[PDB]
Amino acid sequence: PGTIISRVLSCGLKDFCVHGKIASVVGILGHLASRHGDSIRREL
Amino acid sequence: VHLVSQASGAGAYRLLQFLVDTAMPDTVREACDRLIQLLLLHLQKLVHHRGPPPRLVPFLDALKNHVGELCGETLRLERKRFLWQHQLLGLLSVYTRPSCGPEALGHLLSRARSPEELSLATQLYAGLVVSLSGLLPLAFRSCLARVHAGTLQPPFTARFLRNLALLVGWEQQGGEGPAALGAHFGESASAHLSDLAPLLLHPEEEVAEAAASLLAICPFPSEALSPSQLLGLVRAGVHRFFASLRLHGPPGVASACQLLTRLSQTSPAGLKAVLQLLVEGALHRGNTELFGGQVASLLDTNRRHIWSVFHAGVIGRGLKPPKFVQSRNQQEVIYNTQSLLSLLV
């Protein structure tokens, strides 16, 4: 959960800042990884 | 506002309480005020649209459980917060598929002390009547069912009965407001007369007198009273009359007197029942004092006991008792008789 979801969130926000879609896929992946890992994702 | 409307599932009541508390950095305060305004408008849009598949709002579904706390907080009248809470109560009551508005109405009526809180209840009913139908019968049914069950303890019971009496009396006072509201508290209250009659016999005096006032002013059903209903009402009324005459004296008797006069005026059978039961209870061995009516062995024996019995035995069951005594103020007797005779006249 921890480092992987943190890096996914970092990539999503970095792409969002570049644009001023990756974000939808990032959200989907975070939702899928929330099962067995939602608490770590919330902490991140 | 979209996220808080369509996302909150379990912490919705705590989140809303925190947000309202923040909206009780001044710029943050006005931002939260704008947030709550847009949230209420968005919920109004969601509940009222497309009419047909049903919209689903998880925020309101979560808040459905916390309807009692929301009603309680609305009654405390925290300046401008109760506007938001009352409007949210209206929205939630319209939103719920079983139409949970009568539950909120019952909670408001039971917990309302002052006439301002009663005004809050009337405002909620006025808001909901344009959308929903038949709120008052269901609300009265649910509240009385809670009263008869162990729940809804006697303080809130007396408060509910007093509030319902206030509403019925207000509707009878034919101003512009009762006509505009179109509530018909009298009819709905009359529908549950068989349920209200036992409350006249309640052990708690405050509940008893609240029910007595409500019965005194509440209109009987338009058609008529059933013989079982009429007999129950007359017996409860005469019992409350005599009990309140014993307790508070003549001053605390007006409600029962009004109830019994109305019951006598309903029909000749009602008149005969009221007169017969009233005089029978007046002449009963109980309540006759209200109107000047009238009404260690072996060890000690060994202590007293020289070695002969002397007396052959005890005639009957020994000595007679210390005899019966009575005492009551004659002024109180006179005015109790005056109250009874005035009711009879």
Place this chain on the structure above:
Amino acid sequence: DFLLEVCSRSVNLEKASESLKGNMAAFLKNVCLGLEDLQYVFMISSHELFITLLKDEERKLLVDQMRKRSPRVNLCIKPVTSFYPASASVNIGQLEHQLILSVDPWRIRQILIELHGMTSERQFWTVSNKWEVPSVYSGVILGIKDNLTRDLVYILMAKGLHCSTVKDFSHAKQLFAACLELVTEFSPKLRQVMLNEMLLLDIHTHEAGTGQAGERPPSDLISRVRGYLEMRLPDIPLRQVIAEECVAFMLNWRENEYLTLQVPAFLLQSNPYVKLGQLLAATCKELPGPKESRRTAKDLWEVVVQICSVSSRVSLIKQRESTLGIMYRSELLSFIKKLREPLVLTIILSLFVKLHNVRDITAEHISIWPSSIPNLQSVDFEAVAITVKELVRYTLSINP
């Protein structure tokens, strides 16, 4: 005034013991308590003798107790709202909120005009899903080309129907009148629809206010009911509930002669409620006449046993269909629920009691119905039992 005059003349203040003063004070207390009007207790309270006999605090307690007997209470009635014009969306939302809450046709027209002005069209007729109109009317209302007129007509119709449901008959009359005068300008079909709705609303008002009080109809409402029964306009949408209510209204006020003579045959053939009303009026009016009562009672028996009997054995309540009669059993029950005439209800009760006794209860008019019946096995007697139990419950609710 004379009572207090006598009390003052006879008390002889400060020349009598405390006993006499106490007796007089108690008498004044109790006689003021006996009074029902606040002004009378106030004016006896105002007298000098009453003031001097009683201490201040007890007198204040007494007058406060008297005043709290029938307290004056004022309650706010306007629905709670919060008007923040921070933007256009919030203004649209507030106007929609006012539209939902309002039941006044003029304010509704103003709000709709403003909303259509500040938006393109937005199809405001769908802004509230609690506004339900019958589908037969919904088909023609939404066909109006003009957006504002369509939305206004739909809103007025829906609000009028809801106010009729919640017995807010005055506001319902206002809304229906406004919608009628609106639709007269550009459509006769909607005009006839509003006329039928107005007749239904007037029947409800008469049965609510003037009903259960004994006063007869104004004699113009009866003519409108007869006209709606006999109009037979072919190209108009309609609801059978209006025909139900009209026939029930005619039966409630003992208009037996019309129902048994003047109704046209084609109305009997088309509408079943009119046929049933004809049968009930005929069998009620002809009771002293033995042969006519027997004949009409036999006809009524045939139609109702056709209603109760079922095709194929199977429970009639489970399906709600397949009944051999001219009307659903639930429809017959609901139509009877609209009736309040004691004699008609007695006839129905006697009929169902006889039918229940076929396969013992006694009713006063049980001897008129035929004894032997054909298709005995076809009658679903469990449905008949449920029906007679519900009917006796309803009739006891109509006259305990």
Place this chain on the structure above:
Amino acid sequence: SSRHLAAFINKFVQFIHKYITYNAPAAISFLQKHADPLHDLSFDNSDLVMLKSLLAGLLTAAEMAPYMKRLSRGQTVEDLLEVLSDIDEMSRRRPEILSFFSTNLQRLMSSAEECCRNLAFSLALRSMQNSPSIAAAFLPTFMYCLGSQDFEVVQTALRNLPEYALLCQEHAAVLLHRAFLVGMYGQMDPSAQISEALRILHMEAVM
């Protein structure tokens, strides 16, 4: 014969889901301790799609809108019976759904009509059977049914009295007291029902 255990398999997999959710380390430590039985069962009973989803890891409210609307707006006995039968037939397949119809069918328990009242009582009992927590919510309507004037309602309330008394057990005192009072003044004899209910409650609470 895994097909007859479909409900058991669903319940067990849900319990495993909750186990991995609340306490992941202990659940994992159990799974590794018994890895090969799970692998063999998955290979043999490949039709357990949820089990394969677990290996991979290694709605309801909307359906009941028209039913609830029809139940709320229904007047005639036919409509009430129809909607109650539709709820009853599928609730055996999906017991969880009855939690939504609680408040709506509480009013049906006081209905004068016999058939709908009986069916509503059975559905309410099944609902609170699945969820004992909501049983205390049915206390006012049940007490009203016991004390109502309609004698059929009081009779059926007595009929279901032992079951609901076993359900509640904190208001079973007042509930049985109400039952005895209506037996004492109303001429019905609830001695049998009160006896069975009290027997079970005593055999639980102080025996």
